[PDB]
Amino acid sequence: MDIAGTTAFITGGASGIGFGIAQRLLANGARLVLADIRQDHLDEARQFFEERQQGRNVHTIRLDVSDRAQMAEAARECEAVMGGPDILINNAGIDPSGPFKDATYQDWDYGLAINLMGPINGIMAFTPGMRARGRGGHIVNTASLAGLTPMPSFMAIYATAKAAVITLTETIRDSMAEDNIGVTVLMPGPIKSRIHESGQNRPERFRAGSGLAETEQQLAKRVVADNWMEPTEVGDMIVDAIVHNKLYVSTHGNWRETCEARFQALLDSMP
Amino acid sequence: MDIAGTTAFITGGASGIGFGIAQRLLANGARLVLADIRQDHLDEARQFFEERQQGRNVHTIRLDVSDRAQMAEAARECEAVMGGPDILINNAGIDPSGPFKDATYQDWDYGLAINLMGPINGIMAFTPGMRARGRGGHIVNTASLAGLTPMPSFMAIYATAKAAVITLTETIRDSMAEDNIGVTVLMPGPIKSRIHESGQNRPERFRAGSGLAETEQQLAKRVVADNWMEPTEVGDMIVDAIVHNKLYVSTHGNWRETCEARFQALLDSMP
Numbered sequence: 001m002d003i004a005g006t007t008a009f010i011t012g013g014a015s016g017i018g019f020g021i022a023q024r025l026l027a028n029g030a031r032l033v034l035a036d037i038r039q040d041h042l043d044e045a046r047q048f049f050e051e052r053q054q055g056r057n058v059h060t061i062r063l064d065v066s067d068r069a070q071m072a073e074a075a076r077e078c079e080a081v082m083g084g085p086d087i088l089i090n091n092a093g094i095d096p097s098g099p100f101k102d103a104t105y106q107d108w109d110y111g112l113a114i115n116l117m118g119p120i121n122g123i124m125a126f127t128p129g130m131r132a133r134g135r136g137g138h139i140v141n142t143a144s145l146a147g148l149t150p151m152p153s154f155m156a157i158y159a160t161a162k163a164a165v166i167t168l169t170e171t172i173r174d175s176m177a178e179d180n181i182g183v184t185v186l187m188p189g190p191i192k193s194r195i196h197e198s199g200q201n202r203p204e205r206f207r208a209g210s211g212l213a214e215t216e217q218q219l220a221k222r223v224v225a226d227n228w229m230e231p232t233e234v235g236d237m238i239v240d241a242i243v244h245n246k247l248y249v250s251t252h253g254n255w256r257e258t259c260e261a262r263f264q265a266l267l268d269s270m271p
Numbered sequence: 272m273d274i275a276g277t278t279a280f281i282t283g284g285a286s287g288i289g290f291g292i293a294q295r296l297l298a299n300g301a302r303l304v305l306a307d308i309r310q311d312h313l314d315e316a317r318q319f320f321e322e323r324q325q326g327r328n329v330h331t332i333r334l335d336v337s338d339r340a341q342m343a344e345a346a347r348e349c350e351a352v353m354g355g356p357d358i359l360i361n362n363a364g365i366d367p368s369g370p371f372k373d374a375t376y377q378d379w380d381y382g383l384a385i386n387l388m389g390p391i392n393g394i395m396a397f398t399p400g401m402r403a404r405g406r407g408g409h410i411v412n413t414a415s416l417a418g419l420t421p422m423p424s425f426m427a428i429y430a431t432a433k434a435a436v437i438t439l440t441e442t443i444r445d446s447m448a449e450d451n452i453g454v455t456v457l458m459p460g461p462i463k464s465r466i467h468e469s470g471q472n473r474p475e476r477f478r479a480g481s482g483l484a485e486t487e488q489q490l491a492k493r494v495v496a497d498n499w500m501e502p503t504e505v506g507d508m509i510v511d512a513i514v515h516n517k518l519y520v521s522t523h524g525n526w527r528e529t530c531e532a533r534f535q536a537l538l539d540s541m542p
């Protein structure tokens with residue numbers, strides 16, 4: 001689908017991959033709504049676009065993607081202020097990793113709430129209007145290559161949710177197609193971002209009784225490696241996927257062999 | 272690991288696959304705790320084992336796997352009444368399928384609660400004791416080949432949860448191995464069972480506001496095909512998986528080519 005003249009609603013749009021997607025959709029003629037739980041990220045994103053005299057084409061909404069009431073309100077606000085959206089980017093996510101024995105129910109609930117229920121809530125809150133408006137559209141869900149290649153137990157909560165997002169995206173394709181809405185699942189490798197701030201991003205209700213605060217603290221000190229991919233490169237991959245209705249986008253090839261081995265072991269289990 | 276003299280806690284143990292697993296574990300020397308939400312299923316299973324002069328080795332507990340308090344109670348009751356368990360079979364599941372545009376948040380919450388949070392609650396409630404007792408053990412999670420081969424939107428909620436269970440099982444392996452607990456994910460094709468009674472099995476709190484009651488009522492009339500596999504055949508596969516610590520068990524090969532095509536499309540997306 002043509003991006004010019006559309007509105008894109010981008011969760012986690014004010015940092016990292018979502019912000020890279022935002023820049024490149026704007027560059028291709030979309031107007032934007034950036035939805036994010038971090039007011040400071042939103043403010044920074046707004047300033048960045050204002051400096052480039054693009055502030056009129058960008059609206060910001062502070063919300064938690066795991067709060068269904070806020071998501072319903074955001075669908076109304078998006079339509080009223082910016083129109084649409086035609087493009088739905090369910091990209092917000094966090095890193096809930098840590099020693100498996102330390103994780104508590106609060107950590108499971110947090111990890112699944114943001115990384116799996118966020119995209120579901122986006123689909124549920126936004127797609128009825130995308131269908132009704134009858135001008136097609138596109139949905140991008142950000143999963144991870146960690147949802148595909150075998151991962152260790154320290155990453156259980158993350159990998160479990162991200163594998164679900166891949167399958168969610170595959171399964172909804174034919175329903176969305178009824179109304180000329182395409183879908184893409186984005187599976188990144190290492191991208192420069194601020195996901196190391198995940199501890200700050202954890203919603204208040206999941207804080208008490210977490211077993212993983214120490215891990216979040218350590219994570220916050222992790223250096224963004226210079227050889228990780230730039231978010232704008234990912235943004236261009238997403239433009240391409242929307243234009244050409246591509247189901248799968250992977251940013252890196254480094255896990256081809258490990259995925260092949262997993263796939264082989266799965267096939268080998270079949271009579 | 273070795274099965275004789277162990278205790279196996281089996282969710283959904285009173286019907287279908289779980290009951291097939293129960294029969295074959297008992298045959299191989301295990302004592303059983305069957306946990307199920309259906310009292311009538313539990314009573315029938317009780318009568319079956321009494322008729323075979325094995326009642327003393329089978330205890331039943333009525334519970335909902337998505338109720339964490341009841342699962343904590345079950346871990347206490349299992350240990351106190353029957354010992355252990357040494358073998359944890361997180362097998363309960365339901366069919367939350369239906370026309371995608373009809374599914375509501377209640378349907379998503381239901382399908383994820385039983386088919387994904389059920390196994391997680393089992394792991395969280397039971398594995399601390401399995402580690403503490405220091406005699407190793409095994410965990411079997413029942414996913415589905417629907418979590419691997421591409422599925423249509425009518426099966427979105429089911430597929431999404433089942434894919435997650437596969438990844439969950441893979442990721443916990445190294446943590447469980449620290450305490451000589453092996454893990455297996457079972458991925459069945461069509462097995463003779465009573466899963467068509469899923470509407471009856473939906474917990475009360477997920478009923479109001481469901482969009483799929485009509486689908487559930489049609490499902491209830493579905494005939495169990497004579498050429499579907501017998502649960503005891505699956506049970507024997509699971510005996511072998513526990514004895515030999517096999518990560519993956521698939522019951523059917525009919526989806527080999529459709530999985531291959533999915534896997535190739537995933538690999539093709541990688542640069």
Ligand SMILES: NC(=O)C1=CN([C@@H]2O[C@H](COP(=O)(O)OP(=O)(O)OC[C@H]3O[C@@H](n4cnc5c(N)ncnc54)[C@H](O)[C@@H]3O)[C@@H](O)[C@H]2O)C=CC1
Binds near residue numbers: 012093142187193201
């Ligand atoms: N190496 C990487 O950066 C990889 C990232 N991903 C995924 O990419 C997505 C984007 O993350 P990044 O750009 O890396 O990190 P990021 O932290 O720079 O950007 C994520 C944004 O989402 C926001 N956010 C977090 N939780 C939220 C919530 N509950 N509600 C609303 N907004 C929320 C954050 O405040 C942040 O601005 C995530 O889904 C992440 O899991 C996947 C693979 C690799």
Ligand SMILES: NC(=O)C1=CN([C@@H]2O[C@H](COP(=O)(O)OP(=O)(O)OC[C@H]3O[C@@H](n4cnc5c(N)ncnc54)[C@H](O)[C@@H]3O)[C@@H](O)[C@H]2O)C=CC1
Binds near residue numbers: 283308460462
């Ligand atoms: N029969 C088939 O063709 C396939 C079945 N499966 C899976 O096999 C597993 C077992 O299902 P089946 O043996 O086919 O059906 P079944 O309905 O005969 O057995 C499942 C049992 O789990 C119980 N149960 C349902 N919800 C529960 C809950 N919330 N708490 C406690 N118990 C609950 C049921 O009352 C029932 O006795 C499920 O996870 C299912 O998704 C996967 C692929 C194919």
